[PDB]
Design a protein around this ligand. Structure first.
Ligand code: HEM
Ligand code: HEM
Ligand code: HEM
Ligand code: HEM
Lengths: 139, 145, 145, 139
């Protein structure tokens, strides 16, 4: 993550603003539809369209991403509890993080045309990969 | 394997795709986001900056060719393996392109479609297009199997 | 595809493989090195430490089964796709194992063979065994293609 | 990584000693034999068995790995020039680093049976992945 990547990511996620929870819920819905194997991690969830459980989980994921943006230089320390969850208790396969990152990028592209330039796309991809490897670093 | 409704949605969205810019946009974004792919395109001139990549007429001309190949695959969704036999030979035996790059380019194309179509690129449409790009990548990577 | 020299070398090395411990060692090392794979084996008991993993009778028995399946695939090198049809169905449509784990387990098995045979595991023998494990993983991941 | 990973990697690579260049050359030979597509990065190299060019390149890679072990907590700064090389000039596909790491693990397993325990194997895998992602960081 170059400083240019950090500069690009902060502004792009700043223009996300109060739509973060909706974007996270939409990314979760996109991941569940495109990759149904990811649904096995949520057996207790109601995963239909418009689900309030999916809405709340999307808000949580979006808030975690906002915290990661605010703590980009200290992400491993800022995401220690989430890494503990996802690696020890959940032990999610790391390919699922790539799938969710792709769905987040698709949601951002479909909601922020002007912001989703190629350079911002590259920076967001690198930031999401860094978040994913932090969340899987406990393995 | 796409259901008839997925096929109808995919062919309805593809009919409104600008065939002169979408492929070039996808190829340029692939080069910018995964710049090790630039190793396969040294004969395309300047690729130092994202602006130079997206302004490259060779990248635009090649992206047009790749989008045409994707359209050909879309017209033959049940014979993707036979549709991409010679392209698979070219990409594996002649160019030595790793098959993970095919999946990367397919996801970049999905992102480009989402960027261009906005809210009408619904999650079901994206799921159908993910099926399509996965099939195309699998057909292109067959010579490595 | 393996040349006759590669097939002879692979068969000669596999004839000396101890079928009671090699599969268990490979499965245990897969669990230790890629601990997310422990999610598929939560009914095997204690997997909290590497020593507990390598001392698990359930892991040993399942590794015996996996090594038997590998021997079955090795006895039919030209029909790996039909040799692993039911196992592919089980692993894909019933267990939902991501196909990258197949390649991971194959590489772990290659490492275990290198560990056991030392200088006997020459680079040509390793190349032949990499071909074999790649073929096995491809055959097992057919249901996803 | 972890403190335990760092200790295991340090001990295992210390047990390599003066065979580092031989092990690197053998890992390169194994990579060229098992994955011939990696050979396209060395078109000016004599890549036959026993090649002195391969011997020298293996010595260089082994010395780089020794430096990375000596600087395990400052690897990104210690490997800046190598990452610059591999990402800007060479543009190596990242998959190739996984292939070379696997061949290094195979060489270590075939030469150091007592040292290559499952825990040491996991630590070496993690260390090689960290080195690989440092060397592909500039992308
Ligand atoms: C950027 C990627 C991700 C972020 C930021 C993220 C964030 C979070 C957060 C904030 C929570 C709630 C923690 C709490 O309430 O204490 C959570 C839980 C969870 N996550 Fe993720 N996550 C990510 C990726 C994934 C992926 C890819 C999967 C599976 C495919 C996954 C599966 C789960 C599950 C199953 C839970 C538990 C939910 C529940 O039990 O109610 N996560 N994650
Ligand atoms: C994933 C779907 C892909 C499709 C459908 C596709 C399609 C094509 C087509 C139509 C051509 C021109 C063939 C001709 O003119 O005879 C071509 C050539 C080429 N492709 Fe792709 N491509 C794909 C992926 C990739 C990727 C990911 C890379 C590199 C990372 C790549 C590298 C190249 C190169 C360098 C050429 C030039 C070959 C030459 O000039 O002889 N392709 N591809
Ligand atoms: C890569 C080559 C592999 C081979 C040849 C193989 C072989 C086998 C065999 C022979 C069985 C027993 C089937 C039966 O008794 O009917 C089995 C079951 C199983 N496999 Fe694998 N396996 C492979 C990879 C994997 C991987 C990588 C995982 C997980 C990460 C996995 C997870 C399982 C599980 C959980 C079962 C037990 C499920 C059941 O018996 O219903 N396998 N496999
Ligand atoms: C384990 C990770 C690796 C390490 C530690 C490593 C280390 C090195 C070192 C020390 C050099 C010599 C630089 C100098 O002369 O100062 C080098 C050069 C090079 N490496 Fe790597 N390397 C690694 C992985 C790879 C991979 C995976 C490839 C591609 C297959 C690769 C391709 C090259 C090439 C093409 C050169 C230039 C050779 C020459 O012109 O002399 N390296 N690397």
């Amino acid at each position: 993550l170059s400083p240019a990547d950090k500069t690009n990511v902060k502004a792009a996620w700043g223009k996300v603003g109060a739509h973060a929870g909706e974007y996270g819920a939409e990314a979760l819905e996109r991941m569940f539809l495109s990759f149904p194997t990811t649904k096995t991690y949520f057996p207790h969830f109601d995963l239909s369209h418009g689900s309030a459980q999916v809405k709340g989980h999307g808000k949580k994921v979006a808030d975690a991403l906002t915290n990661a943006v605010a703590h980009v230089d200290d992400m491993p320390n800022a995401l220690s509890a989430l890494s503990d969850l996802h690696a020890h208790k959940l032990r999610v396969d790391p390919v699922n993080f790539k799938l969710l990152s792709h769905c987040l990028l698709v949601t951002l592209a479909a909601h922020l045309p002007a912001e989703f330039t190629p350079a911002v796309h590259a920076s967001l991809d690198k930031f999401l990969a860094s978040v994913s490897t932090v969340l899987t670093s406990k393995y | 394997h796409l259901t008839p409704e997925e096929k109808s949605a995919v062919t309805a969205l593809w009919g409104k795709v600008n065939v002169d810019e979408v492929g070039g946009e996808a190829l340029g974004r692939l080069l910018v986001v995964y710049p090790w792919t630039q190793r396969f395109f040294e004969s395309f001139g300047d690729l130092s900056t994202p602006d130079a990549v997206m302004g490259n007429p060779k990248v635009k001309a090649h992206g047009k060719k790749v989008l045409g190949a994707f359209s050909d695959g879309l017209a033959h969704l049940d014979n993707l393996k036979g549709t991409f036999a010679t392209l698979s030979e070219l990409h594996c035996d002649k160019l030595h392109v790793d098959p993970e790059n095919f999946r990367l380019l397919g996801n970049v194309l999905v992102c480009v479609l989402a960027h261009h179509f906005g809210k009408e690129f619904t999650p079901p449409v994206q799921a159908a297009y993910q099926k399509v790009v996965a099939g195309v990548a699998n057909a292109l990577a067959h010579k490595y199997h």
